[PDB]
Amino acid sequence: MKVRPSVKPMCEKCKVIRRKGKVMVICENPKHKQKQ
Amino acid sequence: MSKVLEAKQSAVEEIKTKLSASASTVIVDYRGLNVGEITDLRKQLRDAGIEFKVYKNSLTRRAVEANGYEGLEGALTGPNAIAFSNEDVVAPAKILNDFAKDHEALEIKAGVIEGKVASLEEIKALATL
Amino acid sequence: MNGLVRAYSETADKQVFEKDMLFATLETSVREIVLPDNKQFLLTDTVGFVSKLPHQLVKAFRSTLEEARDADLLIHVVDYSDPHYKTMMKTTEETLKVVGVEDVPVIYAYNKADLLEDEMYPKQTGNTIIFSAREEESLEFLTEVIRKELFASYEKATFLIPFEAGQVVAYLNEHADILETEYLENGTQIVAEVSPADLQKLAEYQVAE
Amino acid sequence: KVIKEVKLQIPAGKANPAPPVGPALGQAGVNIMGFCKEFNARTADQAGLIIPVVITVFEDRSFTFITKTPPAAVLLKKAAKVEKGSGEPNKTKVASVTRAQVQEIAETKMPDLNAANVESAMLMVEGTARSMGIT
Amino acid sequence: MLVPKRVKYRREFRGNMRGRAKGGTEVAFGEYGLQAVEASWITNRQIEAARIAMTRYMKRGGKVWIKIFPHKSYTSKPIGVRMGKGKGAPEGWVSPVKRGKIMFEIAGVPEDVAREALRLAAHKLPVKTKIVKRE
RNA sequence: UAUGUUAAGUGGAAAAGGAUGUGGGGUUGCUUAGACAACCAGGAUGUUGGCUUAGAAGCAGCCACCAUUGAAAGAGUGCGUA
Ligand SMILES: [Mg+2]
Ligand SMILES: [Zn+2]
């Protein structure tokens, strides 16, 4: 998981959600997982 | 809407004129069958001029509303492929039964032979004869 | 390096800097070379040197010459159109010894031999090459030179791949130089040369004549 | 019957134990007689060029040699008189074929193709004609 | 880097950046441009970096305009020097940009690559900008 | 007291930048001659298009990207097999 202040999608299969009051990206490719 | 309605209106009346001109109108449930399986029956019926078609349910019932049909109200459901047979009524009727024995997916029940809506029970006698 | 990459690399768009200014290239770049007979090695370029370089900077380049420190074949590109070429060559060896590159197979390659009038290039004497790195003969010449130097344990050995078992025909096409192939009713017959690792990896498939 | 019926187009007539006639039936115990001689027997007057042959194998070894027609791929070569196809397509044409020549090929394959309209079936040849680039 | 060829006086006042832009508050040459929303000093280094990143994405196709120029110069003192004893020596050149001033222009490229090229340029400048188009 | 906003203890500290938080306006497509989402069925023929390859069949790479049954099916949108 990449913890950076600039979470944004990288591919076309990326998705943006919100859990526990923060923005995160979950993707099938494990290299694309990001958290703010 | 105006573009949509005009195309829908024109196509609806085509079936009604075809249904009036057809000496026998039938339909079968094209569900769970190969794409070319119907084509085998369609090609044989193509040489006899017994080709069929399928459209939207609302448009399909629109033509039957004003084409002197009084027993097809309950027949506008499921996968409907109305077959027009104005040249050889007996041949298209027995054509459906020929494939029905070969393929169980074709339980044809629609019948408008002579313009009269025979029930699904009497269609089988028409289909087998 | 650019000529070799344009000659063999699949990603021919991947090029290197090329200019006349002092110290054009200051960073090492690695490229992967695929000779037509399905053989693989890498080719790296390094920053150049000048005379009486400060000793403070050679300590810093001790890191930048790690790739040459642990290598298999070196090429010492010596200019052949500048009369102080002997001095420049020797200076290169002292700088290399300062870094710590020794006991390394060196192949000298004098460049710019087009400029010199009435010279026979490409040639080869001992471990010395005369060539110009702007022609399609010198480059390929140096390629079979490298082929001689690096790959010398590729002995040939026939194979009989079972007909049902695929995935071995493909493997023995992108990792070997298939001399001849044959088809039988009990499988397929392959004759080619592979690395001594594969002689024990696929020892069972071989069949003796 | 017919457990597996994987279609295997091969060099009809001069069939050899090649991959085209190999692993396609190599999982069903294909015999040389059932791969080369079987096609040789069926392709007596169809030999020489490569034509497809669809075969079916049951649980027991069964050679269901059913040779396909001389497809438009081979037909396009003789009509256009090009040994190697023109990949240039619209970029350039290696050769060209007579307009009446396409009709003869289309008419010969007309029984195989399931198109009621013969005139429409000839139009399908244009796609095959355009596929090879050379008319 | 953009520097004046010669200047009448080497030293100038810092000035001020209050109010709207006097002129150049609209697009005239190209068809898209970067418009400043706030006001800040822009050195010549930031003009260069925001230009290489702006033509590199365009692959040298089409013309760009630079609507600002670093006329003013600024000075600085070395570390370890107390206050006084004159003024510092000039270091660089700046262009005070008040809000509402267009700094760049794009023409000769489609919609998609014009906005993207301007987007990369804006990240190299210390002002909040906006992509604006002609009419 | 009257009408609204915030769910962050924001209120009671701090930017470039990032975001399907939330409320209010505007411009618009489709739709009870049946809109989106789900469930059922179909999703094909010449044909494995040509070239290159040991191997290229929609899916290593480049070239035009057709007609046919039909109301739909792409000389094939992503998996996968060397
Ligand atoms: Mg260099
Ligand atoms: Zn992703």
UniProtKB/TrEMBL annotation, chain A:
Supply the PROSITE patterns for this chain.
RIBOSOMAL_L36 (PS00828)
Q: Where does Zn(2+) bind?
A: 11, 14, 27, 32
Q: Which domain of life is it from?
A: Bacteria
Gene Ontology molecular function terms on file: structural constituent of ribosome
Q: What is this protein called?
A: Large ribosomal subunit protein bL36
Alphabetized, the UniProt keywords read: Metal-binding, Ribonucleoprotein, Ribosomal protein, Zinc
Q: Which InterPro entries match?
A: Ribosomal_bL36, Ribosomal_bL36_sp
* One of the protein's GO biological processes: translation
One GO CC term, this protein? ribonucleoprotein complex
The answer to whether UniProt assigns keyword GTP-binding to this entry is: no
Give the family per the record: Belongs to the bacterial ribosomal protein bL36 family.
UniProtKB/TrEMBL annotation, chain B:
Q: Which GO terms describe its biological process?
A: translation
Work out whether the entry's keyword set contains RNA-binding.
yes
Q: Name one GO molecular function term.
A: structural constituent of ribosome
User: Where is it found, in Gene Ontology cellular component terms?
Assistant: large ribosomal subunit
Keywords per UniProt: Ribonucleoprotein, Ribosomal protein, RNA-binding, rRNA-binding
The record's comment on protein family reads: Belongs to the universal ribosomal protein uL10 family.
Q: What does this protein do?
A: Forms part of the ribosomal stalk, playing a central role in the interaction of the ribosome with GTP-bound translation factors.
Q: How does it assemble?
A: Part of the ribosomal stalk of the 50S ribosomal subunit. The N-terminus interacts with L11 and the large rRNA to form the base of the stalk. The C-terminus forms an elongated spine to which L12 dimers bind in a sequential fashion forming a multimeric L10(L12)X complex.
| Protein name per the record | Large ribosomal subunit protein uL10
What is the native source organism of this protein? Listeria innocua
Species lineage: Bacteria, Bacillati, Bacillota, Bacilli, Bacillales
Report which gene this protein is encoded by: rplJ
From TrEMBL, chain C:
Which is a Gene Ontology cellular component entry for this protein? Answer: cytoplasm
Record: residues binding Mg(2+) 4 = 25, 45
What are the names of the required cofactors? Answer: Mg(2+)
Write the record's keywords in alphabetical order, separated by commas: Cytoplasm, GTP-binding, Magnesium, Metal-binding, Nucleotide-binding
Q: For Mg(2+) 3, which residues are the binding ones?
A: 25
**What is stated as this protein's family in its record?**
Belongs to the TRAFAC class OBG-HflX-like GTPase superfamily. HflX GTPase family.
Known role: GTPase that associates with the 50S ribosomal subunit and may have a role during protein synthesis or ribosome biogenesis.
Q: What is this protein called?
A: GTPase HflX
Q: Which organism is this entry from?
A: Listeria monocytogenes serovar 1/2a (strain ATCC BAA-679 / EGD-e)
Please give the range of the full-length protein represented by this chain: 210 to 418 of 418
UniProtKB/TrEMBL annotation, chain D:
Name the SMART domains for this protein. RL11 (SM00649)
Q: Enumerate the CDD domains for this protein.
A: Ribosomal_L11 (cd00349)
The protein's UniProt keywords, in alphabetical order, are: Methylation, Ribonucleoprotein, Ribosomal protein, RNA-binding, rRNA-binding
Instruction: Please give the coiled-coil regions recorded for this protein.
Output: none
What happens to this protein after translation, modification-wise? One or more lysine residues are methylated.
Renumbered to this chain, the signal peptide range is: none
Q: State if Nucleus is listed as a keyword.
A: no
Q: Name one GO molecular function term.
A: structural constituent of ribosome
A biological process from GO: translation
Pinpoint the Large ribosomal subunit protein uL11 N-terminal domain residues. Answer: 6-63
The residues covered by the Large ribosomal subunit protein uL11 C-terminal domain are 68-135
Sorted alphabetically, the Gene Ontology cellular component annotations on this record are: cytosolic large ribosomal subunit
Question: In the UniProt record, does the keyword Hydrolase occur?
Answer: no
Matching InterPro entries, A to Z? Ribosomal_uL11, Ribosomal_uL11_bac-typ, Ribosomal_uL11_C, Ribosomal_uL11_C_sf, Ribosomal_uL11_N, Ribosomal_uL11_N_sf
The subunit structure is:
Part of the ribosomal stalk of the 50S ribosomal subunit. Interacts with L10 and the large rRNA to form the base of the stalk. L10 forms an elongated spine to which L12 dimers bind in a sequential fashion forming a multimeric L10(L12)X complex.
Physiological role: Forms part of the ribosomal stalk which helps the ribosome interact with GTP-bound translation factors.
Q: Which HAMAP family match?
A: Ribosomal_uL11 (MF_00736)
Family the UniProt entry places it in? Belongs to the universal ribosomal protein uL11 family.
What name goes with this protein?
Large ribosomal subunit protein uL11
In its UniProt entry, the species of origin is given as Listeria innocua
